[PDB]
């Protein structure tokens, strides 16, 4: 039936020549490489839109410009809803969609052509996950699996600490935003895995958010969300 695997791809895997054998999932922030060389004239990928909004596909390429991409939404494999425009040696386009599975079908018109491409998709939205109690110590931290996840948590009553972990795979600035659903005293601290006492940064209140940006190098990190007054619910986004 419809593949439900959650492991993203970074590279195509033939055969992927129509919607029924599409490679995927492609996720935001992870580049996929492939090529349409010789008689390989079509490649198909799928991706999941997690929140309604505007989705952008950018496909930088080298080789012939004689090809394009079409997008289809699950449920209608005949009528494509968007196609790419050539701009500066890439095929780009933005289209509005609603949540659900979509397919990008890249195909060339002349089978003498050699084309290689990389594919970037943006604007897919965040998946919402719940924290997993008990997460009151770093060894029981709830894993944040990628940088397109909103974690939903609460600190009601006895529960005063929620530890989360995330991995940074390449150096860059990370944005940590806790959104307070209720008015209470909550904050967060960030720690390296190797030194749970070394405090790297601390969240700063700005209106209803407690946030900070920090440049981190590759590695695993612990994020402790803890309350110092009242009780309430929050959502937690770690963004790149
Ligand atoms: Ca291919
Ligand atoms: Ca193919
Ligand atoms: Ca909790
Ligand atoms: Ca907890």
Ligand 1 geometric centre to CA of 36 (Å): 5
| Residue 131 counted as an annotated binding residue | yes
Q: Report the domain count for the chain.
A: 2
Technique used by the depositors: X-ray
Residue 13 resides in a domain: no
Nearest-5° angle of CA 145, CA 149, CA 155? Answer: 95
Residue 9 resides in a domain: no
Query: What resolution does the deposited structure have, in angstroms?
Result: 1.9
Residues 158, 233 within the same domain: yes
CB 196 within 8 A of CB 138: yes
Give the C-alpha separation, 102 to 72, whole Å.
Answer: 6
Give the residue from 66, 90, 122 where a domain finishes: 122
Residue 2 resides in a domain: no
Residue 11 resides in a domain: no
| Owning domain of residue 106 | 19-122
Ligand 4 geometric centre to CA of 127 (Å): 21
Give the residue from 93, 122, 151 where a domain finishes: 122
Residue 113 resides in a domain: yes
Ligand 2 geometric centre to CA of 36 (Å): 7
**Three-state secondary structure of the chain:** CCCCCCCCCCECCCCCCCHHHCECCCCCCCCEEEEEECCCCEEEEEEEECCCEEEEEEEEEEECCCEEEEEEECCECCCCCEECEECCCEEEEEEEECCEEEEEEEEECCCCCEEEEEEEEECCCCEEEECCCCCCCHHHCEECCCCCEEEEEEECCCCCEEEEEEEECCCEEEEEEEEECCCCEEEEEEEECCCCCCCCEECEEECCEEEEEEEECCEEEEEEEEEEECCEEEEEEEEC
Residues 90, 142 within the same domain: no
Residues 6+ apart with CB under 8 A from 207: none
Give the C-alpha separation, 26 to 11, whole Å.
Answer: 9
Ligand 2 geometric centre to CA of 103 (Å): 14
Residue 216 resides in a domain: yes
Residue 8 resides in a domain: no
| Residue 35 counted as an annotated binding residue | yes
**In angstroms, how far is CA 78 from the centroid of its own chain?**
28
Give the residue from 122, 141, 158 where a domain finishes: 122
Give the C-alpha separation, 161 to 234, whole Å.
Answer: 13
């Amino acid at each position: 039936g419809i593949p439900g695997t959650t492991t993203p791809i970074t590279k195509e895997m033939e055969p992927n020549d129509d919607i029924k054998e599409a490679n995927g999932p492609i996720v935001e922030g992870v580049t996929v490489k492939g090529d349409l060389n010789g008689s390989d004239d079509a490649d198909t990928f799928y991706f999941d839109v997690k929140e309604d909004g505007d989705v952008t596909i950018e496909l930088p390429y080298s080789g012939s410009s004689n090809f394009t991409w079409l997008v289809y939404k699950e449920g209608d494999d005949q009528n494509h809803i968007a196609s790419g425009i050539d701009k500066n040696n890439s095929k780009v386009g933005t289209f509005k969609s609603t949540k659900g599975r979509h397919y990008v079908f890249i195909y060339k018109h002349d089978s003498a052509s050699n084309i290689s491409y990389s594919l970037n998709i943006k604007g897919l939205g965040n998946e919402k996950l719940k924290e997993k109690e008990n997460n009151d110590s770093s060894d029981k931290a709830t894993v944040i699996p990628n940088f397109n996840t909103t974690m939903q948590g609460s600190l009601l009553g006895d529960d005063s600490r929620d530890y989360y972990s995330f991995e940074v795979k390449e150096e860059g600035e990370v944005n940590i935003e806790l959104d307070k659903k209720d008015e209470f005293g909550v904050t967060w601290t960030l720690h390296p895995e190797s030194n749970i006492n070394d405090r790297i940064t601390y969240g700063q209140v700005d209106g209803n958010k407690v946030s900070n940006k920090v440049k981190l190098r590759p590695g695993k990190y612990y994020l402790l969300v803890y309350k110092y007054s009242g009780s309430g619910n929050y959502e937690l986004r770690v963004n790149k």
